[PDB]
Amino acid sequence: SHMLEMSQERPTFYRQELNKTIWEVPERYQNLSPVGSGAYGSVCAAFDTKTGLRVAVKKLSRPFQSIIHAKRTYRELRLLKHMKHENVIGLLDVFTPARSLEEFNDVYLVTHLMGADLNNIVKCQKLTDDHVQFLIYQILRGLKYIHSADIIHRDLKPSNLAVNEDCELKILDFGLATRWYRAPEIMLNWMHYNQTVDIWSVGCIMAELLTGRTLFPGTDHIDQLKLILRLVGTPGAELLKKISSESARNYIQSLTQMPKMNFANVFIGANPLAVDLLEKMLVLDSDKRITAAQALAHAYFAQYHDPDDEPVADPYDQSFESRDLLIDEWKSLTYDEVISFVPPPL
Ligand SMILES: Nc1ccccc1Nc1ccc2c(c1)CCc1ccccc1C2=O
């Protein structure tokens, strides 16, 4: 009760070659092998002998290359240390082989191994309506939590969604096939947007899960916008009066005017509740777009929705974002976050 530890032992590390480079990790982690071949950024699957589960270990080897990199490393670590939710990738461990700040260079992050991203899942099977309900439900459950912490993903897409063989899903890699899921207001920066940029992305993902194909496969920014307007219709005058960029307003007004298409004619053979939900997600007016919390209560998710089991996050203090610091200062803050990490219970 009042007994304290007067010291602590560093784990024993070992070295090995993986992806043509040396990985140095605690002996806790065994049988490492690369996954994704660079797609997700130096990630190895491993067996965690402590928790007795398969883990994914991600190595950051250039985290402090510049001020921009160092601040991003700090941001990502603070975010990941904060996220504690079934549908958001969080941290089982974070470590460095360094024995002091002086020898600090590499950061390794450890999370539960999922085994695929949603892209791989879509390629390997046609998902049933039940799969789609469950996958989208989990994305929205994760987003409710993330948004409640005043965090926006900003780049939600199938490759940022980890899925396991039990159809469980977690959201990976917060932002800030690359443009197809992006909200229009952030594609051509109309305005200081809101959290529902992520809901637009969910709508695009859900559509693809239902049809088996990309909803708006644009070849560039302008083409992408044209594909969007063809479905949702050209925005009215008042929707224009709300966006700030004069360049944007001018261009879209030169385009041929189009009415909102009938969504039932696009998402054929889909559950009518699914279609109705898509109509609430895929709207241009971000002040009218459904929220994650509102979407969770939509009848489409009647089988999964449980208001008592859709938790929100603790407030997330981002005051560090307003600081302008040197590489060594961001690096020191990051080191502090590494050594102060408290692992989840067993
Ligand atoms: N974001 C973060 C933070 C800490 C540690 C790791 C990660 N990033 C991860 C974690 C797990 C997985 C993937 C990326 C990529 C998708 C994928 C594809 C293929 C096989 C497995 C997995 C998968 O489980």
Q: What is the resolution of this structure in A?
A: 1.9
Q: How far out from the chain centre does Cα 179 lie?
A: 15
Q: How far is CA 48 from CA 26, 45, 59, 89, 164, in A?
A: 10, 10, 16, 17, 17
3-state secondary structure of 67: helix
Cα of 116 to ligand 1 centre, how many Å?
8
Distance in angstroms between the alpha carbons of the first and the last residue of the chain: 20
**CATH number for the segment(s) 1-115+313-342:** 3.30.200.20
- Report angle CA 233, 239, 241 to the nearest 5 degrees: 145
* Mutation choice for ligand 1 from 32, 33, 35, 81, CB with most ligand atoms inside 8 A: 35
Q: Is 56 in the pocket of ligand 1 (CB under 6 A)?
A: yes
115 token code pair = 């085994």
Annotated domain spans of the chain: 1-115+313-342, 116-312
E strand intervals along the chain: 13-18, 21-26, 29-35, 43-48, 53-60, 93-95, 107-112, 161-163, 169-171
Elucidated via:
X-ray
* Mutation choice for ligand 1 from 80, 82, 172, CB with most ligand atoms inside 8 A: 172
Domain 116-312 belongs to what architecture? Orthogonal Bundle (1.10)
Quickly count helices (H) and strands (E) in the chain.
11, 9
Give the residue from 138, 141, 270, 165 showing the smallest Cα distance to 208. 270
